[PDB]
Structure formats: C-alpha cells, structure tokens
Amino acid sequence: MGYFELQLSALRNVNGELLSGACCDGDGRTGGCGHDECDTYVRVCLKEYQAKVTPTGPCSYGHGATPVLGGNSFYLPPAGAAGDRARARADQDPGLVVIPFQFAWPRSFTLIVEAWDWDNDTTPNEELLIERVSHAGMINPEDRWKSLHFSGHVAHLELQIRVRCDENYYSATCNKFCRPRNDFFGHYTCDQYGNKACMDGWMGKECKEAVCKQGCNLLHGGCTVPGECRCSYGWQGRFCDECVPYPGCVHGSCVEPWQCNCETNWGGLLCDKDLN
Ligand SMILES: *[C@@H]1O[C@H](COC2O[C@@H](C)[C@@H](O)[C@@H](O)[C@@H]2O)[C@@H](O[C@@H]2O[C@H](CO)[C@@H](O[C@@H]3O[C@H](CO)[C@@H](O)[C@H](O)[C@@H]3O)[C@H](O)[C@H]2NC(C)=O)[C@H](O)[C@H]1NC(C)=O
Ligand SMILES: [Ca+2]
Ligand SMILES: [Ca+2]
Ligand SMILES: [Ca+2]
Ligand SMILES: [Cl-]
C-alpha cells in the first residue's frame, strides 16, 4: 500500500484559449480574449506503461483532480523538503493531488495531466479542454520530489511527483509488511527492506529469545527479561553459582544443593543444637 503524489506549481496560458482555438469564457470564436479568464483546474490520470503513449483512458492505477487554482496563468508553491515540513504544520494545499493504491507498485507508469475550464456545471464537455500532456516513465518510492516540464500546444506546465509507501510497508513495491512489536510474538523493529531487527538484548528468529546477564550460569538459571539471571530451585547468587543449603540449615554449609554439613560442636539435622 502506498500513495502517488503530484504537485502543480506553474501554468502559463498567455492567450487564454482552449485547445480548440476559442476563448475560455466568451463567444466561441476560433485584441486578446477579454477579462473573463479561464477558470483553470487539473485532472490527473495514472495508468500502465505504454511504449507509445495514447491520450486515452481508463486510468488503471487511479485518478484525482483539483478545484479552480487560478486564471489564465498563475504560480503556486513548489514541492520539496522545505515544503514538506511547511505542510506538516498545517486546510490543505489545493494544487496537491494524492492517489492512494493497494496493489504492488509496478515502478513503471504513464501519467496524463489535463487542464480544464470550469463553468459551474458537472456535465462532461470535451470542448472545455485547455491542454493535455503525458509522460511515460519510471519511479521508485522515496520522499524526494522529481520535477517534470511540459510545453504543449497551448499551455506550459511545471509539476513535481513522488511515490511513498504507507506506514509499516517497505520494499520498492510498497507490498512488504513489517510492524514493530514487543509482546509474546516477538521484540523487533523494521529496517528499510521490511526485515525484522531485534531490539537490544534479544535474539532468535522472531526475536523471542532473550540474552541473560553476562556471567549467568545457564546450567542453574535463565532469564525471561534481558540482562537478568534467575536461578533454578536449589541455587542462588548474582550468577546463580552458589548452592542453597537444606531448608532450615543454621550452622551448616553446602557445596551441592540441599546439603547441611554442621560446623564443629553443632548437631542436629539443621545444625542448630549447641553441643557445649
Ligand atoms: C463556481 O465554481 C467555482 C469553482 O470552485 C470549485 O471548483 C470546482 C471545479 C469544484 O471542485 C468545486 O467543488 C469548487 O468549490 C466556485 O468558486 C469557489 O468556491 C469555493 C466554495 O464556494 C471556494 O472554496 C473555499 O474557500 C474559502 C476561503 O476563501 C474557505 O473558507 C471555504 O471553506 C472553501 O474552502 C473557492 O475558493 C472558490 N474559488 C474561486 C476561484 O472563486 C464558485 O463558488 C462557483 N459559483 C457558483 C455560483 O456556484
Ligand atoms: Ca467556459
Ligand atoms: Ca472565467
Ligand atoms: Ca469558465
Ligand atoms: Cl510564451
């Protein structure tokens, strides 16, 4: 899953006509064109690659459009790293078009951009077309914008495009899923190729095994949290290296678990009897 983004920043139409030859608003005729200028908006078509591009549909990969951005000619804020942070602090840009997708990104594509005159009527009317431009190319998912320059029969266009994966999605297709977690099913983070990177203090496939504190006697103890050393029954100490004497032992010692060797002049099972 990912997104296709397109940013329009410049359009120039000196005469203020349509692709047919007539003026945008007024008469129908093929001095200038007057003061009622073109009410310009943009339509975006995204489809499969074509060695010889056709100005056709359908838009197999997606489509979008903007409202009226300006008149016959106008300038808008371009895209870039500086502009990406300026948007993270904020309604949203009119000249930005976002086309989300769920399929695997095929890297190759064909982009068609159209400029239209608006007359406050939804009815399709092919005679309101100002300019149509097309670009067949190749792009990979990254947060860097790429600039494109178009000069058709009527208008000049300037725009930037880029592709980004959704969150928890990686690889050049945006189709590899990896989400960081820390529960019974693993303790990992994701890298750039959607691979599992164990958190500090863990190992294993799914990062399910933990590293015990350095020096832990792993024949007498283990760990469930990284960096600890909990002893099995019968052992004690920081490294689980010391035996535990017989339960109740007082003046006795062990070398192996559950022993209780009495000191001199001490008797009984627990070495608790004074024999003086
Ligand atoms: C005739 O149409 C124009 C074109 O506007 C619009 O473009 C179409 C292609 C379509 O996408 C519409 O959905 C879209 O609104 C109308 O002009 C515009 O009117 C809108 C809302 O009426 C304005 O948007 C707003 O901006 C104000 C700040 O100024 C903000 O507070 C609002 O919440 C809202 O976002 C838009 O700025 C304005 N544009 C221009 C160039 O005038 C026009 O109203 C319409 N006329 C009639 C009689 O229907
Ligand atoms: Ca018109
Ligand atoms: Ca107009
Ligand atoms: Ca118009
Ligand atoms: Cl010119």
Measured by CA distance, the residue closest to atom 45 of ligand 1 is 120
Number of other CB atoms surrounding residue 6 within 10 Å: 23
Q: Which ligand is nearest to the CA of 155?
A: 5
Which atom from ligand 1 is nearest to the alpha carbon of 70? Answer: 41
Does 67 sit in the ligand 1 pocket, CB within 6 Å?
A: yes
Please give the angle made by the CA atoms of 3, 173 and 114, to the nearest 5 degrees: 40
Please tell me the distance between residue 156's alpha carbon and the centre of ligand 5 in angstroms: 8
Radius of gyration of the chain (CA): 36
Does 120 sit in the ligand 1 pocket, CB within 6 Å?
A: yes
261 strand-pairing partners: 253
- What experimental approach yielded this model? X-ray
At which residue do the structure tokens 């320059």 appear? 149
- What is d(CA 62, CA 100) in angstroms, rounded to the nearest whole number? 8
8 Å CB contact between 45 and 104: no
Burial track 129-141 (b if 16+ CB lie within 10 A, e otherwise):
bbbbbbebeeeeb
- What is d(CA 271, CA 1) in angstroms, rounded to the nearest whole number? 72
- What is d(CA 154, CA 101) in angstroms, rounded to the nearest whole number? 32
Please tell me the distance between residue 121's alpha carbon and the centre of ligand 3 in angstroms: 13
- SS3 helix, strand, coil % of the chain, rounded to 5? 5, 40, 60
Dmax over Cα atoms in the chain, in whole Å?
A: 130
C-alpha distance from residue 99 to each of 63, 96, 133 (Å): 6, 10, 18
8 Å CB contact between 66 and 93: no
- At position 65, the amino acid (one-letter code) is A
Measured by CA distance, the residue closest to atom 15 of ligand 1 is 67
Three-state secondary-structure class, residue 217: coil
Contacts of 240 (CB under 8 A, 6+ apart): 216, 217, 220, 221, 229, 230, 231, 232
- What is d(CA 61, CA 111) in angstroms, rounded to the nearest whole number? 10
113 strand-pairing partners: 44, 133
Please tell me the distance between residue 15's alpha carbon and the centre of ligand 5 in angstroms: 9
> What's phi and psi for 84, nearest 5 deg?
-65, -40
Three-state secondary-structure class, residue 46: strand
